């Protein structure tokens, strides 16, 4: 009677029902396995944590408490694996990492 969400059934934070619906409506296969949305939202939350944690690290590093896109760029580019995952990714108002080639420095 009292419903209990599949995400809670995994102690999970994204909605499994939502994602299951999207999977079914997304025309990928006619039939859907059950633990697939589970594993799916799980890895989603994983990456979410992985990225937001660095973003907050940066926000702290620049003495602010609200994360802004600049942090998003900084964190994405200062990772190797993430950036390779998002090497073809542009972020609006993101700027770049300040980095100077040694040759142009004065000496």
């Amino acid at each position: 009677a009292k419903a209990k969400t599949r995400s809670s059934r995994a102690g999970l934070q994204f909605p499994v029902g939502r994602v299951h619906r999207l999977l079914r409506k997304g025309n990928y296969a006619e039939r859907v396995g059950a633990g697939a949305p589970v594993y799916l939202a799980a890895v989603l939350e994983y990456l979410t944590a992985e990225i937001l944690e660095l973003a907050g690290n940066a926000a702290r590093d620049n003495k602010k408490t609200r994360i802004i896109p600049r942090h998003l760029q900084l964190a994405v580019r200062n990772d190797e694996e993430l950036n390779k995952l998002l090497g073809r990714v542009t972020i609006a108002q993101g700027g770049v990492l300040p980095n100077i080639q040694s040759v142009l420095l004065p000496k």
């Binding site: 896109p69 998002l86 073809r88 990714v89 542009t90 972020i91 609006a92 108002q93 700027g95 770049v96 980095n99 100077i100 080639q101 142009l104």
Partner: protein, 86 residues
């Protein structure tokens, strides 16, 4: 019902902005021959996208360009952007 035809806003691409662009690139010293080069290549990219942008617009039967239009175009060309829907 005012539908005029524009001409040479590519020279609306000011010299200082271009230099600023290079400076965000970390560029140190610059030819004068660079600038028109930039205007042209920029132009190239501009139509290359805007064409399919309009394609999206039209297949929607539609008369106005949506952002998601640009989104889908740039995604076609693998130029993924975040922050505008889509």
């Amino acid at each position: 019902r005012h539908r005029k035809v524009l001409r040479d806003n590519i020279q609306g691409i000011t010299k200082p902005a271009i230099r600023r662009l290079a400076r965000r690139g970390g560029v140190k010293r610059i030819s004068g021959l660079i600038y028109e080069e930039t205007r042209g290549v920029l132009k190239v990219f501009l139509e290359n996208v805007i064409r399919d942008a309009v394609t999206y617009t039209e297949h929607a039967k539609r008369k106005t360009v949506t952002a998601m239009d640009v989104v889908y175009a740039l995604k076609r060309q693998g130029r993924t952007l975040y922050g505008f829907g889509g």
